[PDB]
């Protein structure tokens, strides 16, 4: 006590063409033409951008309590994973900068950096970083639910995977794979990016 | 902010004879005899003892981030679930009293109350309280792992189930269903009970 959490890199962010699809249904955008054709449409001194495991030292070894993403020197994860705890990376203490309990989000080292917005009917990929597994891209079709109207995803991952990022076809992050309500769906948890 | 977590009762603690068994293997104690027979051997002003869901208010509704147990007026859960956050029960604020980051445990309202110790070769039941499911007793045979030598369990539950209690045949709690290392095993997370 304290400084019980530390980070370890696990992957880079990208959309994988030909990633595995999972889910009840697919959303497929079709282009129809009048001619009868139908078509299915320097080293920086900053933490290296990527996906990282958030790890807590336990009795059987370090267990993964969640995942997050460094982008532009800012670490983004879920509020329930750390609750504002300092994070150790390379001997350095990372202090929290911004949080939204309501969206279940938090950033360390600056304000929310993600710019992606998800659009109803598009499919996304979750870059699931499950405890003891290699990162895996899972293509899925979110539904929407009303309140902001929110994307929600019906996929089931191991405990500790929350904070894995959800990317669109451009490879931009549209949110983080959240905790769910239950018919287990997780919100696409996103905030607006920050400014001076 | 703050007081984002609240509790809701879900079950009582007991061993269920004839609960579902799950796991790779069974440990069965056999009694052999020389004669050729072989045998398979007032309302209190305190929170009501039981198993409770620990809930965080999100955008899709309240999500379950973990489970804990009131016993003798003390609430016991996992350190990673709350990290010492106040818990709301019936309008009242519950403040943390004791924690062990190393065992991943915390109690609110007093010191650790559980007296159960698990013994190599005995089977136990996890009273799994998964998000959106009814409590379920799961009988399983832990292995042991060395460091205290610790029971460890190979069962997979939904995110949010950690803190569910593990009971022996007498209905006493031998620990709480922990976070795992990964071959995903969770520690039987237990501490010695407390004194004046
Ligand atoms: Ni401290
Ligand atoms: Ni399919
Ligand atoms: Ni989680
Ligand atoms: Ni506050
Ligand atoms: Ni069996
Ligand atoms: Ni957990």
Swiss-Prot record, chains A, B:
It is a peripheral membrane protein. It comes from the Viruses. Residues 42-196 form the Peptidase S7 domain. Coiled coil: none annotated. It is found in: Host endoplasmic reticulum membrane. The active site is at 80 (charge relay system), 104 (charge relay system), 162 (charge relay system). Forms a heterodimer with NS2B. Interacts with NS4B. Interacts with unphosphorylated RNA-directed RNA polymerase NS5; this interaction stimulates RNA-directed RNA polymerase NS5 guanylyltransferase activity. Interacts with host SHFL. This is Serine protease NS3. The chain holds residues 1478 to 1648 of 3392 of the full protein.
């Amino acid at each position: 006590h304290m400084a019980d959490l530390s980070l370890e890199k696990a992957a880079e962010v990208s959309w994988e063409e030909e990633a595995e699809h999972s889910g009840a249904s697919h959303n497929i955008l079709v282009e129809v033409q009048d001619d009868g054709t139908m078509k299915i449409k320097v080293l920086w001194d900053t933490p290296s951008p990527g996906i990282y495991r958030i790890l807590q030292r336990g009795l059987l070894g370090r267990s993964q309590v969640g995942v997050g993403v460094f982008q532009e020197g800012v670490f983004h994860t879920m509020w329930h994973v750390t609750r504002g705890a300092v994070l150790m990376y390379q001997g350095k203490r990372l202090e929290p900068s911004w949080a939204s309990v309501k969206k279940d989000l938090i950033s360390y080292g600056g304000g929310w950096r993600f710019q992606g917005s998800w659009n109803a009917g598009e499919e996304v990929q979750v870059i699931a970083v499950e405890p003891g597994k290699n990162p895996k891209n899972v293509q899925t079709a979110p539904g929407t639910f009303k309140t902001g109207e929110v994307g929600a995803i019906a996929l089931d991952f191991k405990p500790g995977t929350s904070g894995s990022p959800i990317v669109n076809r451009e490879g931009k992050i549209v949110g983080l794979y959240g905790n769910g309500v239950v018919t287990y769906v997780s919100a696409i948890a996103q905030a607006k990016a920050s400014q001076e």
